[PDB]
Curated annotation (Swiss-Prot), chain A:
<protein>
    <recommendedName>
        <fullName>Protein transport protein USE1</fullName>
    </recommendedName>
</protein>
<comment type="subunit">
    <text>Component of a SNARE complex consisting of UFE1, USE1, SEC20 and SEC22 or YKT6.</text>
</comment>
<comment type="function">
    <text>SNARE required for targeting and fusion of Golgi-derived retrograde transport vesicles with the ER.</text>
</comment>
<comment type="similarity">
    <text>Belongs to the USE1 family.</text>
</comment>
Swiss-Prot record, chain B:
<comment type="subunit">
    <text>Component of a peripheral membrane protein complex consisting of DSL1, SEC39/DSL3 and TIP20. Bound to a SNARE complex consisting of UFE1, USE1, SEC20 and SEC22 or YKT6 through direct interaction of TIP20 with SEC20. Interacts with DSL1, SEC39/DSL3 and the cytoplasmic domain of SEC20.</text>
</comment>
<protein>
    <recommendedName>
        <fullName>Protein transport protein TIP20</fullName>
    </recommendedName>
</protein>
<comment type="function">
    <text>Required for protein transport between the Golgi and the endoplasmic reticulum. May contribute to tethering of coatomer-coated retrograde transport vesicles to the ER membrane through interaction with and stabilization of the SNARE complex.</text>
</comment>
Curated annotation (Swiss-Prot), chain C:
<feature type="topological domain" description="Cytoplasmic">
    <location>
        <begin position="1"/>
        <end position="170"/>
    </location>
</feature>
<protein>
    <recommendedName>
        <fullName>Protein transport protein SEC20</fullName>
    </recommendedName>
</protein>
<comment type="subunit">
    <text>Component of a SNARE complex consisting of UFE1, USE1, SEC20 and SEC22 or YKT6. Interacts with TIP20 through its cytoplasmic domain.</text>
</comment>
<feature type="coiled-coil region">
    <location>
        <begin position="6"/>
        <end position="26"/>
    </location>
</feature>
<comment type="function">
    <text>SNARE required for targeting and fusion of Golgi-derived retrograde transport vesicles with the ER.</text>
</comment>
<comment type="similarity">
    <text>Belongs to the SEC20 family.</text>
</comment>
Length: 85, 150, 170
């Protein structure tokens, strides 16, 4: 059974969650640094990677694995086309 | 009273019955080419004796050994040794090898003699592991491959 | 092309993800139940591991370097990277000092840099967690795969035993 992946839509969803993560992190460090309490770390700052760290890492890893599976498929198609030529 | 039961009854009866069963095993010479494996009658008798003796073994009522010495500094009290009920079936199996080792290596152990022992175990193992597996393995005795092997 | 420390970070991270995909592929390879009908594959795993540790030293190194660079870029900022003494706890980036009169454009630039470096330190915390997870994964798979090879040799020797002769005259 040939493993069909179509890592495209999974890459899309991973980029979706990735930009979500990135804007959440941006707003979080915005609230933190712009945090007027220079002596207290906001629960939002901590909570970002208390809540999304594993999600961010798994999503990024899935993105890279999907892009690498896709680019392996791509070099495979490239090699098969060049050998076909 | 548990230890008294485990000696005067489990260990004593087990030692007698094991002397008997090892007697029957050496009378069978099971781990030999001379052993009449076609004697399915004798194979069944020895299989039933192994069954009975191993069941009697499983009748070792575990000494509730006081699992004491729970400390931190450096007790590391792991002296279980997995003391199993006396399996002089399993022990007598290699008693011929014990005689061969004691007589062949009767001299004191030297550093080189250690590797001699090791290669002796290796060759005896090669020639007898699956031989004895063929002879003594009795799936009907609740003897699976992991159980028998280990 | 002055290669910013974050650029080195992202290139090294991209390489690290390459290596993670590779070693995870090796793990799932050994999770395939393959018989020699493995050794240099193990060797390649060790080499890739030592690569992971070289690159992780480089990563934490350039990471500290970027931290220092940030600290010396802006005067008012006092950042301190406190490595978590415990696995279950993330590392810490306590911004100790910041004067709110800094230029807004430079403010947002520092914001974006802090954003990237926080992403990096947390992704690196999760990456160290993940490599610990995957080496424990590999060793657990070694304990399970030596045992599965034990059981496969036991089953093959068992069926060989069984087909040889087991008193089949009854």
């Amino acid at each position: 059974a040939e493993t069909s992946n179509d890592p495209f839509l999974s890459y899309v969803l991973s980029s979706k969650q990735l930009t979500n993560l990135n804007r959440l992190r941006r707003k979080a460090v915005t609230k933190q640094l712009g945090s007027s309490d220079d002596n207290k770390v906001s629960e939002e700052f901590l909570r970002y990677q208390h809540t999304y760290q594993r999600e961010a890492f798994e999503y990024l890893q899935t993105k890279h694995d999907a892009h690498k599976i896709m680019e392996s498929q791509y070099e495979q198609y490239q090699s098969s086309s060049k050998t076909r030529r | 009273v548990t230890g008294k039961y485990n000696d005067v009854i489990i260990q004593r009866l087990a030692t007698n019955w094991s002397n008997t069963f090892d007697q029957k095993l050496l009378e069978a010479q099971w781990d030999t080419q001379k052993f009449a494996s076609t004697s399915v009658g004798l194979v069944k008798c020895l299989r039933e004796n192994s069954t009975k003796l191993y069941q009697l073994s499983l009748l070792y009522l575990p000494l509730e050994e006081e699992t004491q010495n729970g400390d931190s500094e450096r007790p590391l009290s792991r002296s279980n040794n997995n003391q199993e009920p006396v399996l002089w079936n399993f022990k007598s199996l290699a008693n011929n090898f014990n005689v061969r080792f004691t007589y062949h290596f009767h001299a004191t152990s030297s550093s080189s003699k250690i590797e001699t022992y090791f290669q002796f175990l290796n060759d005896y193992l090669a020639e007898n592991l699956y031989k004895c597996i063929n002879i003594f393995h009795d799936d009907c005795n609740g003897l699976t491959k992991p159980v028998i092997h280990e | 092309m002055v290669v910013t420390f974050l650029q080195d970070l992202e290139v090294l991270q991209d390489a690290l993800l390459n290596n993670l995909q590779k070693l995870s592929a090796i793990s799932r390879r050994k999770e395939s139940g393959e018989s020699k009908h493995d050794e240099e594959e193990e060797i390649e795993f060790e080499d890739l591991v030592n690569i992971i540790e070289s690159k992780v030293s480089d990563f934490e190194s350039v990471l500290k370097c970027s931290i220092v660079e940030m600290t010396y870029k802006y005067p008012e900022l006092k950042l301190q990277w406190e490595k978590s003494p415990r696995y279950d706890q993330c590392d810490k980036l306590h911004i100790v000092k910041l004067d709110k009169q800094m230029n807004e454009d430079i403010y947002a630039q520092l914001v974006e840099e802090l954003d990237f470096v926080l992403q990096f330190v947390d992704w690196f915390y999760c990456y160290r967690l993940k490599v610990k997870e995957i080496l424990r994964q590999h060793h657990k798979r070694d304990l399970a795969w030596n045992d599965e090879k034990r059981d496969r040799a036991i089953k093959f020797h068992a069926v060989d035993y069984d087909k040889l002769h087991q008193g089949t005259s009854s």
